[PDB]
Amino acid sequence: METILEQQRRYHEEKERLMDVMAKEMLTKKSTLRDQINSDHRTRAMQDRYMEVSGNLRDLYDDKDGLRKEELNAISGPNEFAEFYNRLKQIKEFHRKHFEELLKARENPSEEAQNLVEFTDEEGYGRYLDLHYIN
Amino acid sequence: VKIGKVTKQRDSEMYPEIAEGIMPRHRFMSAYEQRIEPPDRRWQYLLMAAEPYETIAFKVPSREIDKAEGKFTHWNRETKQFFLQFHFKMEKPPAPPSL
Amino acid sequence: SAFDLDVVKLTAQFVARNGRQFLTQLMQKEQRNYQFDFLRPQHSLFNYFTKLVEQYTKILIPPKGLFSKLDQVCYRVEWAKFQERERKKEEEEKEKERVAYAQIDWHDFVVVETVNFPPPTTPE
């Protein structure tokens, strides 16, 4: 039946996709993390926070990024929120989920419906895209 | 499958001004232009240059040797296809290889 | 492309556990040119294949181990920024080179005589 390897694979891949998305976000506007982290600092005292200079200049390494307005920062923070929700879900299901004659056996059935004229470029693109509205 | 190498050595330690910016630079020059302005020409030279040291040339009678075909298509032009394509600069030992 | 995808991913599934043990036998049994191309590095898709297998090979890594995980995504961001900086620097050095190459006397000749590097441009 369904090979769990493929499912677990797709899961790790999607998790990777999400991490990459919220990382791209944290990249364009470091404030997203900084803001958050600062608050976290006063709730869980242990938390290590970045150099003040970074925070102020709104930079992560060398490049100082443009300052964004509050509404957008918050927005993206809630978006990242739902993203992290998805991630937590996938991580969960994954935790709950984790010969030659059969090889030819399946490769034979793969011959099924040979006349399927259609371009298929929509697995990683629809996901990458699914996490990156207008025209 | 054909025939094609020079090993140029530099000083033994004997202001970041192009010191690390530029590696050994090579160019193919036609003898049609020389300081003499007379007597002879008609062949190419594989000139190699470094800031302090003096230029160096190597005559290439054969119309084409080792002129390969898409060896590696990654685009960091450096100076030209020739330099990136077939040169190595051992900067730690100061040895410039060209082939 | 669903067919190609499916065969790549399947032969990749088996190739991940049996390696070439089941595929290297299939190629000789069935006799496929297509199968041979898939096995080979000549066929472009081969590369993506090397990906899938690796990925599956990875799933075999922590089988029997659960993942119990923001900081990370920040660090990834940081990395990207760093890489970006390296790219920038490179571009700069290249620029310098172009300037100097364009600015030296290729007529100061003083000749003497007349007439694999990729694995060499590393360190070991």
What does this structure look like?
This is part of a larger assembly, with chains A (135 residues), B (99 residues) and C (124 residues). With 135 residues, chain A is mainly alpha-helical. Chain A has six helices and no strands. Chain A has helices spanning 4-28, 31-41, 52-57, 70-97, 100-107, 124-130. Chain A starts with a helix and ends in a 5-residue tail after the last helix. Chain B is globular, with a radius of gyration of 15 Å. Chain C has 124 residues and is an all-alpha fold. Chain C contains five helices and no strands. In chain C, helix 1 crosses helix 4 (46-59) and helix 2 (20-30) runs antiparallel to helix 3 (33-39). The longest helix of chain C is centred in the C-terminal third of the chain and has 32 residues, at 71-102. Classes of the chains: A mainly alpha (135), B mainly beta (99), C mainly alpha (124). Chains in contact: A-C, B-C. Chain A binds chain C through residues 3, 5-6, 8-9, 12-13, 19-20, 22-24, 26-27, 30, 33, 36, 60-63, 84, 91, 94-95, 98-100, 103-104, 106-107, 110, 114, 116, 118-121, 123, and chain C through 1-3, 5-7, 9-11, 13-14, 16, 18, 22-23, 25-26, 29-30, 55-56, 58-59, 62-67, 69-70, 72-74, 76-78, 80-82, 84-85. Chain C: SURP motif repeats lie at residues 7-49. Chain C: This is Splicing factor 3A subunit 1. Chain C: The record marks 10 as: Critical for binding to SF3A3. Chain C: It is found in: Nucleus; Nucleus speckle.
